[PDB]
């Protein structure tokens, strides 16, 4: 069931190559890739959520991603996964994807936005499925013999592997501050803001309405958004809230293993 995703939110992170040979911050980013099965099926973890809408309902034609300070909706038909030649998607839920792929040396993901813009991210990888039996073959035959191997199972029931969710940190946005004649103006736009300026000694505090600081430049000031109402996964790419973490809940990993014959 999808009840475990009720109070969560997506996030942004770092990607080493964004299409042209330069780094960027992207709404879709890669975590570890698991290849423990002997049939050659892969499992992938990303930073967006598939199958759940922005009002906490289930709909299999939609996905939600994190825009600047607010999530939004997008189409599922634009999701693609490719290494060398294109791959084929077998099942999705939440953060996770299943795929079958040819051999290669890279891996790429991408999708299409709600204003018609595309995003990509690329990571290195080495893919070579194992050999079963005493012959090397390229496709499934019509006359043969059966030997054991193992695979992944298409099920979304509760399992014994779990991951945690914590409280999000603050977000520094520079754009809020502006520069006027000999003064600095901070814009709230409906969100709580924390500020600190070094001009004229020190000035610290919180605010909810417009405020003006006298005898100060645009520099020597800092702003951030500091109140949140949702929980988020504790990636090794996002700084900690405090010296000791605050747990709020946990969610499970689908698709366990099993024995089959091939």
């Amino acid at each position, epitope marked *: 069931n999808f009840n475990v995703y009720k109070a969560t939110r997506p996030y942004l992170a770092h990607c080493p190559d964004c299409g042209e040979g330069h780094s960027c911050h992207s709404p879709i980013a890669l975590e570890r890739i698991r290849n423990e099965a002997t049939d050659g099926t892969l499992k992938i973890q990303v930073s967006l959520q598939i199958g759940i809408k922005t009002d906490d309902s289930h709909d299999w034609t939609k996905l939600r991603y994190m825009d600047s300070h607010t999530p939004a909706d997008a189409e599922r038909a634009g999701l693609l996964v490719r290494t060398s030649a294109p791959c084929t998607i077998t099942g999705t839920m939440g953060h996770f994807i299943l795929a079958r792929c040819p051999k290669g040396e890279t891996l790429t993901v991408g999708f299409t936005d709600s204003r018609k813009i595309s995003h990509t991210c690329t990571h290195p990888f080495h893919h070579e499925p194992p050999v079963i039996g005493r012959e090397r073959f390229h496709s499934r035959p019509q006359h043969g013999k059966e030997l054991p191997c193992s695979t992944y199972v298409q099920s979304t029931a509760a399992t014994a592997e779990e991951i945690e969710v914590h409280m999000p940190p603050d977000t520094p946005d520079r754009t809020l501050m502006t520069q*006027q*004649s*000999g*003064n600095v103006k901070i814009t709230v736009n409906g969100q709580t803001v924390r500020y600190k300026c070094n*001009c*004229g000694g020190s000035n610290e505090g919180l605010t909810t309405t417009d405020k*003006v600081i*006298n*005898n100060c430049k645009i520099d020597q000031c800092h702003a951030a958004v500091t109140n949140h109402k949702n929980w988020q996964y504790n990636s090794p790419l996002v700084p900690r809230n405090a010296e000791l973490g605050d747990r709020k809940g946990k969610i499970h990993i689908p698709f366990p293993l099993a024995n089959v014959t091939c």
Partner: antibody
Framework: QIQLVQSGREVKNPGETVKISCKASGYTFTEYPMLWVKQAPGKGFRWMGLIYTNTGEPTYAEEFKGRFVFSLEISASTAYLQINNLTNEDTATYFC??????????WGQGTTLTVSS | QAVVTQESALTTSPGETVTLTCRSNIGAVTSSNCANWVQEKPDHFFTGLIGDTNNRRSGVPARFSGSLIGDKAALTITGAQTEDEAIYFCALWYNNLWVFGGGTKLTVL
């Protein structure tokens, strides 16, 4: 009562220098900036720049990024305006004004500069 | 070069309400321009009236107020008297530098 006191009139010749003062009284000098404005004879006002009383670093406008130099004296609570290498086109009337938040509340009495050959 | 356009003069009668308008030649006036209004004393002295669009200077009586009307900045004065026959100016701030207006004269009959 806040009062701004400026210097008196003076007559100059080309190639000389002139110093215009602006005395401050009634408020703490280092809490607000000092602004300068120029009014040519027969023309409107023109903005030239301001200086931060807390740090002393001045900013100049595009048209006056030249011979003009600003200065401050914290101990005397007085700001100075200096124009060097005077020419006959430099005759005008000058004022000093304070900035309180976004509003230009107060004004000086003005000083008249006459340059002739 | 941006300039602010103002009317030459306005004539009114005692007890009425006077509204003055100014507008720049490069675009509309918005909340971020921080329009300023000052008044020139007949003795060739200057004092400010309206700063930051809708903030009245301390000590200025209740008959002075300002706001933005459409694409033009406006200053409205109620209870006009012969003492109001002065010069009014409009000032606008765009990017690095200020912009000054041409001024106007008030006549009360």
């Amino acid at each position: 009562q806040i009062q701004l006191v400026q210097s008196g009139r003076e007559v100059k010749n080309p190639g000389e220098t002139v110093k215009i003062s602006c005395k401050a009284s009634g408020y703490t000098f280092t809490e607000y900036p000092m602004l300068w404005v120029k009014q040519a004879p027969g023309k409107g006002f023109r903005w030239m720049g301001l200086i931060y009383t807390n740090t002393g670093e001045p900013t100049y406008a595009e048209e006056f990024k030249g011979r003009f130099v600003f200065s401050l004296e914290i101990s005397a609570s007085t700001a100075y305006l200096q124009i060097n290498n005077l020419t006959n086109e430099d005759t005008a009337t000058y004022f000093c004004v304070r900035d309180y938040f976004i509003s230009l509340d107060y004004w000086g009495q003005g000083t008249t500069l006459t340059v002739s050959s | 070069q941006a300039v602010v356009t103002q009317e030459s003069a306005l004539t009114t009668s005692p007890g009425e309400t006077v509204t003055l308008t100014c507008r720049s030649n490069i675009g509309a006036v918005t909340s971020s321009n921080c329009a300023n209004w000052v008044q020139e004393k007949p003795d060739h002295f200057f004092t400010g009236l309206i700063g930051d669009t809708n903030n009245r200077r301390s000590g200025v009586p209740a008959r002075f107020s300002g706001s933005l009307i459409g694409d033009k900045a406006a200053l409205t004065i109620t209870g006009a008297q012969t003492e109001d026959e002065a010069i009014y100016f409009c000032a606008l701030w765009y990017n690095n530098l200020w912009v000054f207006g041409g001024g106007t004269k008030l006549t009360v009959l």
